[PDB]
Design a binder for these strands. Sequence first.
RNA 1: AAAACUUUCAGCAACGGAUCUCUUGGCUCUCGCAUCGAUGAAGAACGCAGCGAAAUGCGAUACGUAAUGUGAAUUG
RNA 2: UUGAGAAGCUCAGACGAGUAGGCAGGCGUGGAGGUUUGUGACGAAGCCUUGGGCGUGAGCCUGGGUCGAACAGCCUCUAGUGCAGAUCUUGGUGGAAGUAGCUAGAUCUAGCGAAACCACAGCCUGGGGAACGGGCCAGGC
RNA 3: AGAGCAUAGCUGUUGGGACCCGAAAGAUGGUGAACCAUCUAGUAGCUGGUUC
RNA 4: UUUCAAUGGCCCGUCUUGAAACACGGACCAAGGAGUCUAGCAUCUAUGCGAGUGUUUGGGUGAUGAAAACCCAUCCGCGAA
RNA 5: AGCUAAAUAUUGGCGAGAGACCGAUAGCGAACAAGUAGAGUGAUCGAAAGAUGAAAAGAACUUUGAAAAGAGAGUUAAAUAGUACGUGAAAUUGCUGAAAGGGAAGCAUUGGAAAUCAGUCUUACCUGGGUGAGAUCAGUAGUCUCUCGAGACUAUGCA
Lengths: 192, 305, 148, 125
Amino acid sequence: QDEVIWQVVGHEFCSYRIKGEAQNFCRNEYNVTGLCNRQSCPLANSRYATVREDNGKLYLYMKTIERAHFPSKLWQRIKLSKNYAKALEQIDQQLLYWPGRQIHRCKQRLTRLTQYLLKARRLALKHQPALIPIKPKQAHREASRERKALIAAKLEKNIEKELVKRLKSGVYGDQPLNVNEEIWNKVLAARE
Amino acid sequence: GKIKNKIVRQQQYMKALHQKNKDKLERRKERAKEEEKDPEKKRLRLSENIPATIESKRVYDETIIEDKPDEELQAELKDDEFSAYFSEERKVPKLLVTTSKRASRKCYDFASELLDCFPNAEFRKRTGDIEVHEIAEAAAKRGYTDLLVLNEDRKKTNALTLVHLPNGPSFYFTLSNLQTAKEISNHGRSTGHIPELIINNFSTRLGMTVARAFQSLFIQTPQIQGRQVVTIHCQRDFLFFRRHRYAFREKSNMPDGIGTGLQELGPRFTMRLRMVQKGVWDRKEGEVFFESNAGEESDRRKFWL
Amino acid sequence: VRYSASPALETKCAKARGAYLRTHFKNSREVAFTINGMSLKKAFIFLDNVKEHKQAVPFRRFNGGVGRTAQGKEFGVTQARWPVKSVKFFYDLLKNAEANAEAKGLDMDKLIIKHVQVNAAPKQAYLSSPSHIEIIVAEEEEAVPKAN
Amino acid sequence: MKFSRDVTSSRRKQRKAHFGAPSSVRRVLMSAPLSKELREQYKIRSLPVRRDDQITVIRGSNKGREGKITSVYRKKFLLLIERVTREKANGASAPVGIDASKVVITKLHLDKDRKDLIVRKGGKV
RNA sequence: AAAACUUUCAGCAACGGAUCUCUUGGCUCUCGCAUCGAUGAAGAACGCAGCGAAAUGCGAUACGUAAUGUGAAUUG
RNA sequence: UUGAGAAGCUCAGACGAGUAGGCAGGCGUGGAGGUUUGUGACGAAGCCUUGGGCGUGAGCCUGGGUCGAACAGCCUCUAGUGCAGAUCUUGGUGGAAGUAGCUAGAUCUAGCGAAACCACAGCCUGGGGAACGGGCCAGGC
RNA sequence: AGAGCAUAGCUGUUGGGACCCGAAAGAUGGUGAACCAUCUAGUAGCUGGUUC
RNA sequence: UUUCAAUGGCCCGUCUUGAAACACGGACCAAGGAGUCUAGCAUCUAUGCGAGUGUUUGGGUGAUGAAAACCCAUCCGCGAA
RNA sequence: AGCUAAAUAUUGGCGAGAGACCGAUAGCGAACAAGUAGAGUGAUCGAAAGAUGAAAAGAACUUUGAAAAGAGAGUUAAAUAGUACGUGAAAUUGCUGAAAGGGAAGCAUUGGAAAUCAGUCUUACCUGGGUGAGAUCAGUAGUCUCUCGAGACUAUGCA
C-alpha cells in the first residue's frame, strides 16, 4: 500500500506537486511541511497528523491506516487550545507513541500557524493603505484626453487675457507696480 | 466592406477618394466665386457655420452657475468652512505640506518646488504610524488651516489629498505630468514674493467648492512688485497648475496692443479630481460629497468640474 | 498627427506637413538643414534669393559631386548648388506654416523655424526617393526681469 | 453532445453555413425572444423578427430603448429600430444596427401567416 | 581641441512588414451514391445586369418565366 | 536531531587539455492525453527596454512601456522541432551616389537619374621563419 | 532435465528519392536545327552546406 | 549604461596544410532552409507469457464518435526436435 | 460457341462526416479579380496579393493652397486603429540630445568619472499592573452532525 502508493505518486505523477528548481512542493492541504517528501506526503503515509487553521482556530488532524478506504471519515479533528503550552500538550497526548518526527513536524506547524494568526490580528489593528489597481484602458483614455484638454486650454493665451483684463479694472492701487511707464500711459489713453 | 480583395478595394477607395476631393473642390471653388461677388452670402455663412468643439457641444447640466447673482448661492458661502478666508476676518492661510510614509528624494524635489509656490507653508516629514486624521487634529491645534499630503510610491508622486482644518472638506486628486523647473524650457528662478492666483473655467457648482478650496491656500494680499502669477485652469475636468513670471509689453495681437511675456517658473503638473469628502479625510469611513465614476467619464462631452 | 519634435503643442507652434512629396530626398535634406533655426521672414528672403540664383544652398553631408561656388562663404564651406524644385516645396510649406500661425493668432514678428525634418518616403531600376517634410515655427522664447 | 452523423460540429462548416446563408435562412437566423407576457400568452418562446414589430432593446449601449422595427438588414444580420439613431459629423442621424437576439418582442405585428405560425408552434390566441 | 565632419549611445519621426493572434482556404483519411451527348454535350464566342471593380447569374422570356413552399422583404 | 523525494540524506580522498569518435544528463519549439478546483479585458500572446533577478550554460523569472484575446507550469505522448554561412531561397534595405550619366536653360545651372562591386579596414621602415602586410613586434609619422 | 515467442525502444546495417544543394542528358509526345511538356526526385566515389 | 586610463586582443566558416600559407564563401537584416518516413536483418535493453508464443486476414461486438475499446472460431508463422 | 449478381477496385463525378495535419515565404499554382493578371508566333508558361472599428460613427465645419494636401477642429474605449488602416521586430534613414574623436573601429580584464537603478529600516519579543471584553473558562442548560466524546452552533454567567 504505502510503498506502492509512494512509487506511483512520488515518482510518476501527483496533481499536488509543484516542481521548483531547488525543491518540490505539495499543493495538498494536509501536508505539514508543504514540501514533496516521502515523510511529508499525506497520500503515501497511512498514519499522518497535521495542524491546519479554520476561521481562526487551529485543529489537529489525524488519520489512521484503518480508515484509509472511507474518505469521508478518514481524517479526525480536535481543537487546539489558544494557550500555547496547552496546545503543545494536546498534540503530545493525541499523538502518543507516534514517531518523534511526526510530533516534531506538528508542533513546528503549530508555531507557524500561531504566528500567522498573531500577525493577522496585528495587521487588522494597523492602518495600512489600500492597494488600488491600475487600469490600462483608463490610463490610455485619460492620457489622450488630457493631451486634447491641454491643447484646448490655451493656457498662455488665457493667462495673459486675464492678466490684461485685471490690469484694465485696476485691481492694483492708483498705478500698478508691475508696469513700465510707457505701457501704463498706453493703458490710460486706451481705457479712457 | 463588400470587396474581399485587398488590392481591388484599395483601388476602389482611391478612385472614390479622388472623386470626393474633386467634386468637393468644384463646389468650394463655385461657392468662393459666388460669395466674393456677393459678400452677403459670405457674412451669413461664417455666422451660421461656426465650427463645433467639445466645449460648445458639452452636455447640459443644471448645476452650472449663472452670470446673474443669486442670493441663495451667496448665502451658502457666507457661513461654510471656507468663510473664514473670504470674510472680513481675513485669516491668513497656514499650510502644512507632508508626504506619504517613507518618501524618496524625487518626492522631496516636487515638494520643494511646491513649497516655493506657497509662501508661509512648511514641510514636515511623515514619520512612523501617524495617520491623516491624527495629523489633521494635531495640525489644527498648531494653527494650521490647510493640510496637503503628497502620495508617492515607486519613486513617483501620483496623488494629492488636501484637507481644510479643522473639519473642512477633504479633496483627493491624482497628479500627472509632473515637471519640475529644471525640465521646463526657458524657465525662471522663483522669488520670495507672494504669487497672484487666477482661476478659470470652474463653472459648475462643484467647481465653486474646488475653486474656493484652491483659492483658500493663497494669501489674499499678493505682492504686486514681484509680478508672479499661479494659475489653476480646469479644462475638460483637468486642472492644470502653472506658475509664471509675467511682464506687460506691446503686442500686435490684442486690440489694445498690450500683452504679457510669461516665463515659466514651475512646478508644472495636472490634477484630476477623484473624490470630495465632507470632513477630514477617511478613505474607509468618510462622507462622500463626490466620487468620480470612470464609466460615465467615457462621455467626452460631459464634465463635473 | 504627431511630429518628430516634442514641440508643436498649441502654445506657440504652427505646424506644416508634406507627405510623399515628389522631390529628391538628398536635396531636400540640405535645404532643410540650411533654413533650420532661422527666422521665418529671413527664410522667405533666402528662398527668394535661391530662386533668382542670388544665393546658394550649401551641401554639407551629400556634398559628393557638388562643384566649388563663391556664394557658400556665408556658411563656411564652398560646395553649394541652386536647387529649385526642393526650394519650391519648402516655400509652399513655409507659407502653410505662416498661414497656420496667423490663424492661431500668434505673434508674427518673432516666428522662427524651430524644427524642420525631412524623412524618406516609400521608394517608387529608377526607384527615386520621395520626401516627407515637416516644419514647426514658433516664437523666439524670451526672458523677463526677475524682481528689480 | 450531438449523435447524428447528419450534422457537423466543424467550426469551419458551421461558420461557412452562417455567413454564406441565403435570405430565406437568415429569416430564421434573425429570431428574437418574446416578452414574458407574450411568451406565456402565445405559448411561444421566440419568433423570427419582422418589420412593424415592437421591441425593447435588452443589451448594448441602447439598452432599455423601445420602438418599431423599421427594417431588418439581413446582409449584416442587423435590426434597424425607429428613433434609435446616432448623430453623424454633419448632424444627420445614422440608424444603429441591433442584433435580433439583443431585443425582446413586446408586441407582435400579427398577420394571418403569423397567426397560422402561432397555432403551428403549439401556440394559441 | 568648440563648430562642421566622423563615430558611439539614447529619444522621436520615417522605412519595412517580422512576430503574435485567426481563418467561409488547403491537405489527408473514411463513408454514401451512379447521373454527359445528334431530344445538340464538354468547350469557345457574343449578348442581358438601372450602376455594379470584377466575379457570379442568365440567354432576345437574358443576375431569369411557370409551379410549389416559406410569408415581407430588397440594400452599396 | 527530527537529515527516509533510500530516486533521499551523509562522510572521505583523488582528479580536471582535447580533434575523430564513444557516453550521460539537461535547455528550447509546434501539436496530443492527463493535470494545475491554473493565468486573462482590474489586460492573454507578441514586441520594446542603459529596470531587477536566477542558472557554468542552453535558457528562465520579473518591473516599466506598448498592446488587444487568448495562454502557460508539471507527468506522459508526438514531430515538417533549434541556423551565421550552402557564389542558399523569398522579401526588405543600404554604401558605391546624387556618382556614371541623359532632358532643358545659359563647359556651367536646372530637372530626371543607374549598375558592377561591397568581411572589415586603409602612412611607411625593418624583422617577423608559414604569406606575413592590412591588422602582429620594435621604430618613425 | 529444452528457451523461446510477441511487442516497444536503442544501435548498427541493407533497400527504396533516402541528409540537402549540386554533372552534358537521353527517351517519348508535341509547337513553330530550334522550342515546349512529361518520364525525373535520372545518373555524383566528387563540390558546397548540414541548426541547442 | 556611456566613456576614459593601464594591459592585452590578426576575420569568421570551409578546404588545404605538421602547421600555416593559402585559395574559397561573407554588403546588411528578417523569414524559410538539410539523417526523414517505411520494409528487412542483426545486437542490446525493457515488458508480457513461457515449451510454448503471437487477438486485429477475418468474425463477434460496440446506443454516451461505433475508424476506438472489448471478445475469439479455424488456421498459420516462429520455437520445441 | 454464349451469358451471369455478390464479395473486389476507385487521386474522377454527386454529396457527406472527420482529423495528434498546414496556418498566408505554410497549406493546392490559387484563403483575395487564380489557371486570373501577365509572358510567348505557338506548343505551353504563370504570379504577387488575407486582418480599420463593436458600430463608418470613414473626420461635418472654419482656414491656407492652382491643386494634392496641411492646420484648427470633430468621431471613437482607443486615431500609439484614419482605408499608406490589428500587433508593427530587424536591417536602413532623418532630426534632436549627450559623449568621444593624430591614419580605423574593434572586444576582453580592472577601476575612475558621469548618468541611472536595485535597497533594504524598530518592530517586535519578554514581563507586568489596571480596566473592561468573551470560549476552547462555567461547583452551567439545549440542538445538530459523527461516534461515551469528537466537531458545529444556541441561551446564560465573565466568579
